[PDB]
Design a protein around this ligand. Sequence first.
Ligand SMILES: CC(C)C[C@H](N)C(=O)O
Ligand SMILES: [Cl-]
Ligand code: NA
Ligand code: NA
Length: 507
Amino acid sequence: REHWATRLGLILAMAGNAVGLGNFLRFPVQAAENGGGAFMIPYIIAFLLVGIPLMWIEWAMGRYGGAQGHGTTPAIFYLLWRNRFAKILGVFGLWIPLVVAIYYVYIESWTLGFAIKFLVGLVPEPPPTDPDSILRPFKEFLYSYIGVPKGDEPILKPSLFAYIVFLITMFINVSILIRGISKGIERFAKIAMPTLFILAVFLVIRVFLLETPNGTAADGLNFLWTPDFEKLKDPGVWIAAVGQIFFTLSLGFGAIITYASYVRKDQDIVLSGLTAATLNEKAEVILGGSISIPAAVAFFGVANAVAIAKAGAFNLGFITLPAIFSQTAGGTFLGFLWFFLLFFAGLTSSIAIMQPMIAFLEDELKLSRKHAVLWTAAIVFFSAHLVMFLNKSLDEMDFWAGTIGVVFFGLTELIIFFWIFGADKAWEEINRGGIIKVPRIYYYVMRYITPAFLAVLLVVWAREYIPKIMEETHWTVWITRFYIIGLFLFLTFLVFLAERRRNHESA
Ligand SMILES: CC(C)C[C@H](N)C(=O)O
Ligand SMILES: [Cl-]
Ligand code: NA
Ligand code: NA
């Protein structure tokens, strides 16, 4: 079995796993729609009670399963709770990251294609003060890229260059992942994380030199870090906070478990996971929240910034920032820098959420690495046509997998590790091999505070919000569900195909 050759390489690979698009695209909108600082207070709180404990549990289950040659949540769940329903619940650890990747690769291909369009200079030409006259050309640019429909049919029709860039993005993912751990993700993280940091800091410095009659870049920072105690009683704020914390730290996708499987049994995971979390957070609030929000605020006031944020998720990342850069000297090169930063971010995160399936095919089906990688590729590439051509088929995938399945699977793996596999035993498993020891106070949070807190949050979530999706939506969403549910069944079948061949090799 392969291993992280360099400790630093392990840390950088886990960072690139965590440091992705949620640090640069999701978090700005998440903070803008939720009163800014009013959203920071839960984000901080839920970072201590949910982020770090689930991080350490992810790492512990990963190292435990990897010591016994299993880097997937079905096998590891069977190794923590010996039952068939354990394997059934572990199937989610392969279903969630796959469904996430199905559209994560598409958005990463968006970033790559936009970087190419900006580098070659094939960009819109905004005529020289009306904000609509500047937000309109880049809006139509994004629409010409992804091919959003125009009439009544919810049928996407992406540009040919977009499909070509998607092919190139999948092929780049394949060329990276075909070289394993110590030769592929490690030597790529060692190169991408410094470049990512450099680009982020350069764009931060460039954004801070922006001033308009609608304010300066400091106003967005103020609104971001100005709390508002009038909103801590809104459960939607806490819902969004814990969801974003699950997302930005890869918590609940089973990918951190997958990388932790390649950790040598004796090497540290406590300080490792804490370091990865701290690096991702420093890349989030210090950098990601200090580029989009300050520019949008300085250019349109907090009111119109929140308006653009509530308009859509890509209004800020794919429209607002390029429209603002088109107003500055060398702004085409600046948008190229921004999109290239996003491309490496999505790259280091997407090569991380596609590893559980290959680990399953290698460890549980005894497939060669090349064939496992190529079949997982073909699966993702084919299934991505459902997201590329069916309108609003990405939102359902992100909801059930990246938004609902994450909290569900986090609670599940928490109850499995501590409440089932053994609170004392799993606590020791976390504290074993660690350079530093896990604080005594997080034992109670892991076993008592985190499950009850997440349970109350999930109760409020399911009681006051979900029934709006299973009714007030277009019928085409079923096409996605009918597929993704049918993608779950498929995986279970392979799980069966695992537990049967294991009864054959021993014979
Ligand atoms: C699913 C994860 C890889 C997401 C990533 N941590 C991000 O913030 O974009
Ligand atoms: Cl295009
Ligand atoms: Na992140
Ligand atoms: Na990443």
